[PDB]
Design a protein around this ligand. Sequence first.
Ligand SMILES: *[C@@H]1O[C@H](CO)[C@@H](O[C@@H]2O[C@H](CO)[C@@H](O[C@@H]3O[C@H](CO)[C@@H](O)[C@H](O)[C@@H]3O)[C@H](O)[C@H]2NC(C)=O)[C@H](O)[C@H]1NC(C)=O
Ligand SMILES: *[C@@H]1O[C@H](CO)[C@@H](O[C@@H]2O[C@H](CO)[C@@H](O[C@@H]3O[C@H](CO)[C@@H](O)[C@H](O)[C@@H]3O)[C@H](O)[C@H]2NC(C)=O)[C@H](O)[C@H]1NC(C)=O
Ligand SMILES: *[C@@H]1O[C@H](CO)[C@@H](O[C@@H]2O[C@H](CO)[C@@H](O[C@@H]3O[C@H](CO)[C@@H](O)[C@H](O)[C@@H]3O)[C@H](O)[C@H]2NC(C)=O)[C@H](O)[C@H]1NC(C)=O
Ligand SMILES: *[C@@H]1O[C@H](CO)[C@@H](O[C@@H]2O[C@H](CO)[C@@H](O[C@@H]3O[C@H](CO)[C@@H](O)[C@H](O)[C@@H]3O)[C@H](O)[C@H]2NC(C)=O)[C@H](O)[C@H]1NC(C)=O
Ligand SMILES: *[C@@H]1O[C@H](CO)[C@@H](O[C@@H]2O[C@H](CO)[C@@H](O)[C@H](O)[C@H]2NC(C)=O)[C@H](O)[C@H]1NC(C)=O
Ligand SMILES: *[C@@H]1O[C@H](CO)[C@@H](O)[C@H](O)[C@H]1NC(C)=O
Ligand SMILES: *[C@@H]1O[C@H](CO)[C@@H](O)[C@H](O)[C@H]1NC(C)=O
Ligand SMILES: *[C@@H]1O[C@H](CO)[C@@H](O)[C@H](O)[C@H]1NC(C)=O
Ligand SMILES: *[C@@H]1O[C@H](CO)[C@@H](O)[C@H](O)[C@H]1NC(C)=O
Ligand SMILES: *[C@@H]1O[C@H](CO)[C@@H](O)[C@H](O)[C@H]1NC(C)=O
Lengths: 216, 32, 97
Amino acid sequence: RCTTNYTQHTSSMRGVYYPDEIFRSDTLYLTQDLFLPFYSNVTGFHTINHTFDNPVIPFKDGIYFAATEKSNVVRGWVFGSTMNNKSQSVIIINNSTNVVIRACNFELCDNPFHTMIFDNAFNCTFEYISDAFSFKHLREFVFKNKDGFLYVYKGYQPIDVVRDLPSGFNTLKPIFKLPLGINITNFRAILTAAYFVGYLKPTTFMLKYDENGTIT
Amino acid sequence: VQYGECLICAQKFNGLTVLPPLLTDDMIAAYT
Amino acid sequence: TDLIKNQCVNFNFNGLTGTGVLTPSSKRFQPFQQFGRDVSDFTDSVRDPKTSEILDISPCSFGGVSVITPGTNASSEVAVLYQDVNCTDVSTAIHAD
Ligand SMILES: *[C@@H]1O[C@H](CO)[C@@H](O[C@@H]2O[C@H](CO)[C@@H](O[C@@H]3O[C@H](CO)[C@@H](O)[C@H](O)[C@@H]3O)[C@H](O)[C@H]2NC(C)=O)[C@H](O)[C@H]1NC(C)=O
Ligand SMILES: *[C@@H]1O[C@H](CO)[C@@H](O[C@@H]2O[C@H](CO)[C@@H](O[C@@H]3O[C@H](CO)[C@@H](O)[C@H](O)[C@@H]3O)[C@H](O)[C@H]2NC(C)=O)[C@H](O)[C@H]1NC(C)=O
Ligand SMILES: *[C@@H]1O[C@H](CO)[C@@H](O[C@@H]2O[C@H](CO)[C@@H](O[C@@H]3O[C@H](CO)[C@@H](O)[C@H](O)[C@@H]3O)[C@H](O)[C@H]2NC(C)=O)[C@H](O)[C@H]1NC(C)=O
Ligand SMILES: *[C@@H]1O[C@H](CO)[C@@H](O[C@@H]2O[C@H](CO)[C@@H](O[C@@H]3O[C@H](CO)[C@@H](O)[C@H](O)[C@@H]3O)[C@H](O)[C@H]2NC(C)=O)[C@H](O)[C@H]1NC(C)=O
Ligand SMILES: *[C@@H]1O[C@H](CO)[C@@H](O[C@@H]2O[C@H](CO)[C@@H](O)[C@H](O)[C@H]2NC(C)=O)[C@H](O)[C@H]1NC(C)=O
Ligand SMILES: *[C@@H]1O[C@H](CO)[C@@H](O)[C@H](O)[C@H]1NC(C)=O
Ligand SMILES: *[C@@H]1O[C@H](CO)[C@@H](O)[C@H](O)[C@H]1NC(C)=O
Ligand SMILES: *[C@@H]1O[C@H](CO)[C@@H](O)[C@H](O)[C@H]1NC(C)=O
Ligand SMILES: *[C@@H]1O[C@H](CO)[C@@H](O)[C@H](O)[C@H]1NC(C)=O
Ligand SMILES: *[C@@H]1O[C@H](CO)[C@@H](O)[C@H](O)[C@H]1NC(C)=O
C-alpha cells in the first residue's frame, strides 16, 4: 500500500574516497575522478515535525550523500529512471535486521516510508541481502555509475551538531559494486533528522598517502 | 648535498642503474 | 599450485602475471586492496587469493657483463665482471645453469 528547504551549505573538504583497490605507501598521487569539489554548494534536507523532505533528486552520473542522525530516520534510497514499474530501479535499504538490495520493476509508493516502499515488484533482475544485525552520528556515502555498476562508498564519524554539516574531511571506503545493469538518472531518499546532497565532478586531486597507505 | 644500485643490492624493473666511480670519497679526501 | 618462494619463478595470480621473486611482506593493505604498486607504475606486492598472505615481487637479477683482457697479441686470457650482482647468485646459477 501507499500513504500520501534546500538550504545551501559548504562541502568543506568532504567527499574524498579511495579511487582504487591499489595499495600505496608514503607518496603523493595525482589523479582525476568523480569527487566532490572542495567548498562546493551542498543542499540540505530536513525531517522536522510535519515537514519531511523526500523529493526525487537528479543523479547526474554520481552524487554525494551525507546524513546526521540520532534516531536513524534515513533508511535507504531508490535509484532509477522512471521511478515506477515501467522499468528497472533499485531499492537499497537498511531493513532493520539486514541490508536489502533489490532491482525490479517496482510499483513504488509516491510517499514511501511496516515497510512501505512499493506495492509490487516485477521482472526482478538483482537481489541481495546482507548479514543479520541488531545529532550523534554522521553517515557518509558516495554513489557512482560505472559500466552498469553502482559503486557505493561508505564512511562514519561521531558528531555534535544540530542543523549544520561540520567542516572537515574524511576518506570513505568502498562497500558495494552492484551489477545492476539499470538506468539511474534520478533517486529518492527513504525515510522512516537531516541530510545533505552534493554532486560529483571529474576533478583533479592530489592525494597524500601515509605510511599505512591511508589518505591523510 | 628509481634505478638499480648497491650499498646489499637492489634492482628495478625499468632497466636503469647507476655505476660507482673509480675514486671513492675517501680517496678524494686523501688527495685534498 | 603451491607458492614457490625466494627464487625466480613464473607466476600467475588471479589477475597478475609475470616473472620474479616472491617474498613475504608486512605491507599494511586495506580490507579492500588486492595488490599494491611502487612509487613508479610497477606492481609492488600481491595478496594471495587463496591464503590472503601478502608477498612482494622482486625483479630477477640482471645487468651488464664485461670482460677484462690483456691484448690478444700478448696473451689469451679473460676475467668476467657481472655488474651489480651478489657472487653467491652468480656462482649458484653457473653450477645450476
Ligand atoms: C504499475 O502498476 C499499477 C498497478 O496499480 C498500474 O496502474 C493500474 O493500471 C490498470 C490498467 O490500466 C488501471 O486500471 C485497472 O484495470 C483493472 C482491469 O480489470 C480494474 O479492475 C481496476 O479497477 C482498474 O480499473 C489501474 O487503475 C491502475 N492503477 C492505478 C493506481 O491507477 C500501472 O499502469 C503499472 N505501470 C506500468 C508501467 O505498467
Ligand atoms: C599505521 O602506522 C602507524 C605507525 O606510526 C601505527 O601507529 C603506531 O602503532 C603503535 C603500536 O600500538 C603505537 O603505540 C606505540 O608502541 C610503542 C611500543 O614500544 C611505543 O614505544 C610508542 O611510543 C607507541 O606507544 C603508536 O602510538 C602508533 N602511532 C600512532 C601515530 O598512532 C598504526 O597503528 C598503523 N595502523 C595500522 C592500522 O596498523
Ligand atoms: C650475498 O648473499 C649472501 C647470502 O644471502 C649474504 O650473506 C648474508 O648477509 C647477511 C647480512 O645482510 C648475514 O647476516 C644475516 O642477517 C639477517 C638479518 O635479519 C639475519 O636474519 C640472518 O640470520 C643473518 O644474521 C648472513 O649471515 C650472510 N650469510 C652468510 C652465509 O654469511 C651476502 O652479504 C650478500 N652480499 C651482498 C653484497 O649482498
Ligand atoms: C582457504 O581454504 C583453506 C581450507 O582449508 C583454509 O585453510 C585453513 O583455514 C583456517 C582458518 O584460518 C586456518 O586456521 C585454523 O583455524 C582453526 C580455528 O579453530 C584452528 O583450530 C586451526 O589450528 C587453524 O589455526 C588453517 O590453518 C588453514 N589450513 C591451512 C592448511 O592453510 C584457508 O585459511 C582459507 N583461506 C582463507 C583466506 O580463508
Ligand atoms: C527484512 O529482513 C528480514 C530478514 O532477512 C526479512 O525476513 C526474512 O525473509 C526471508 C525470505 O526472503 C525468510 O525466509 C526469513 O525467515 C525472514 N526472516 C524474518 C525475521 O522475517 C524481511 O522480509 C525483510 N523485509 C523486507 C521488506 O524485505
Ligand atoms: C529556505 O528556502 C528559501 C527559498 O528561497 C531560502 O531563501 C532560505 O534561505 C532557505 N533557508 C535557509 C536557512 O537557507
Ligand atoms: C552557492 O550557494 C550560494 C548561496 O547563497 C549562492 O549564492 C552561489 O551562487 C552558489 N554557487 C553556485 C555555483 O551555485
Ligand atoms: C523484463 O525485462 C526484459 C528486458 O530486460 C523485457 O524484455 C521484458 O518484457 C520485461 N518483462 C516485464 C514483465 O516487464
Ligand atoms: C536513461 O534514461 C534517459 C532518459 O532520457 C535516456 O536518455 C538514457 O539514454 C537512458 N540510458 C540508458 C542506458 O538507457
Ligand atoms: C705484438 O705482435 C708482435 C708480432 O711480432 C710481437 O713481436 C709483440 O711482442 C707483440 N706485443 C706484445 C705485447 O706481445
